[PDB]
Point group: C3
Chain length 248, copies 3
């Protein structure tokens, strides 16, 4: 006759559950694991474009002014008029659109990394509308190291991810955007030294990308974030994610 559940050190079902969750958390943090990046572009109509990349060793996303704009697939997007918006945004008075402010422009950006990133390695190039980091190429460092600004997304006392959020509320907030982060490596084994370097090149090939525009934050939270155990931070500063280490 077996011990009774939840009363002794022989609840092996319980120990196996805790190990299963701990193994996933720590595997993700091993050099064999993913590091993941999400870039969220929020539009005035309440919809949200997500750009996601999942890869070994390091991960990144690179967007231009045009690629960040809202596209409603299979609906009217006034493509000619929006090309004229682009011309008017690349150079002042450079186009002839029928509008002052395109509602396809993002109102905000949230950058989220998986908990397997090392925040000290995070780099971002938030450039102008023609993809220069700081106004002119000749004065541009090709990135800023913005890790100190990333907030921890905590759930149940566990870091389930990292967030950097900035609004684009002003008419001159017209941007291009690239972001990069490196997977944790507390060892002194360089994953990109000659013993393993070609595998890092293969990781550039193997990185999986995902993009979709969700009709609102609720839908994103329900059918993307929660569905796939991703970290998130909503407009009301509510934290989402699944804590795993040492937990049932």
């Amino acid at each position: 006759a077996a011990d009774v559940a939840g009363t002794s050190n022989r609840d092996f079902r319980g120990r196996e559950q805790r190990l299963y969750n701990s193994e996933q958390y720590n595997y993700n943090n091993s050099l064999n694991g993913e590091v993941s990046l999400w870039v969220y572009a929020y539009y005035s109509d309440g919809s949200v474009l997500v750009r996601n990349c999942n890869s070994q060793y390091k991960v990144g996303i690179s967007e231009c002014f045009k690629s960040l704009k809202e596209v409603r697939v299979g609906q009217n997007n006034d493509p000619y008029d929006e090309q004229e918006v682009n011309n008017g945004v690349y150079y002042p008075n450079g186009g002839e659109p029928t509008k002052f402010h395109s509602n396809a422009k993002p109102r905000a950006i949230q950058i989220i990394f998986s908990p397997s990133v090392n925040v000290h390695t995070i780099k971002m190039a938030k450039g102008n509308s023609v993809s220069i980091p700081k106004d002119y190429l000749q004065r541009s460092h090709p990135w800023e190291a913005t890790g100190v600004k990333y907030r921890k997304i905590h759930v149940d006392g566990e870091i389930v991810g990292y967030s950097h959020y900035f609004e684009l509320p002003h008419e001159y907030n017209s941007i291009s955007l690239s972001v990069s982060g490196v997977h944790k490596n507390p060892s002194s084994y360089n994953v990109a030294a000659p013993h393993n370097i070609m595998d890092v090149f293969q990781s550039c090939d193997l990185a999986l990308k995902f993009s979709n525009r969700y009709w609102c934050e609720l839908e994103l939270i329900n059918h993307y974030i929660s569905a796939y155990a991703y970290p998130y931070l909503d407009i009301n500063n509510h934290k989402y994610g699944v804590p795993l280490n040492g937990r049932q």
Copy 2:
């Protein structure tokens, strides 16, 4: 008076032909040569999307669920309805398309490598519809090493390429897909060690890509495969390619 053709060791025209073919085969296998990857997505209407990349040192292709779907350029693709298909495939009951199964979904994938690949280096991430390799990121190795499954495409006793083929016949066969392979290097000279590493970075830049949807396998065989001396394996297990080493 010259020797008679095909009767002696002084048929220099004959020797030059054989060397020409041998030189092409072996150049392709040198570190100076191409390694090439083709991903074929087969649709129920009989058409075939090819994605090709040709590059030095290593090569790869990365696709998401959406990018693998059939697009008939300049014809009706019901873009709104197919966006709803995507929503319904990213999460169950997540959309409202007018169909149960999109005929734009691939029925099968064939992955073919040039004979200059080392099959031991082949990696594939066959992920789910939101670009996670194995259901959740926390448990995902970012690839599987599938080389042992690649079949040799033989012609005249020569390996003209390698094939891995899998059908997607079930309703739940909704995938994302990345593939990578490394060019043969039997030497102990690491092409990505510091003496040559920046050239491997340049190869990422220089890799040439090609995509097209052919109306059927016959057309692909005739105007793509055969036209450009590529390897192929058709649905009837017939092998295509041009044998070169030691041959006239």
Copy 3:
């Protein structure tokens, strides 16, 4: 009472201006600086597609036959007919378009690098319409080193950039195109050796891209080149750029 402007060595405003310009020029040339690449595709209707990438350490652009073709956003591009053009260009007599020559085909290409490139590192793969560098993969070196052909764009005796220009005036000038260059590094410190290699991988992530089709060379010169202090060479061999080193 301060010295009079432009009469002595105590015009600190003057010295600061000259240093400001010199600092930008030399920063651009430091390993911290950008290296930039522009590929210009010129169309018969006088418009010009620019593809630009700006990145640390090294930079590149890769295009196929299709991606180089003129696309007039929000206007009629006869997409079905132009897909048939593609089929007819990938293989002779392979399509059924309503035209002999597509006016969407580029008439010329100009490749321009920032002055921070090392011309000895420049590589180009000018391939055929199906993205093979030299007719067949088996005989293809994956690039040509074309630096000796690049012309210096001089302004006021300063090199503000480098240009390689080739026309595509013949019916058989149907190409694919990739180009790559490496940022100057006169030091013996290898930026891609293990001490800094992962940063070069991050630079692949962080590279910012830009594309736009301008209606004519005048507009490109005015609202792109000149607006953002880029180098250029127009059809009349007129040089554009801003000289900076040692200059007010």
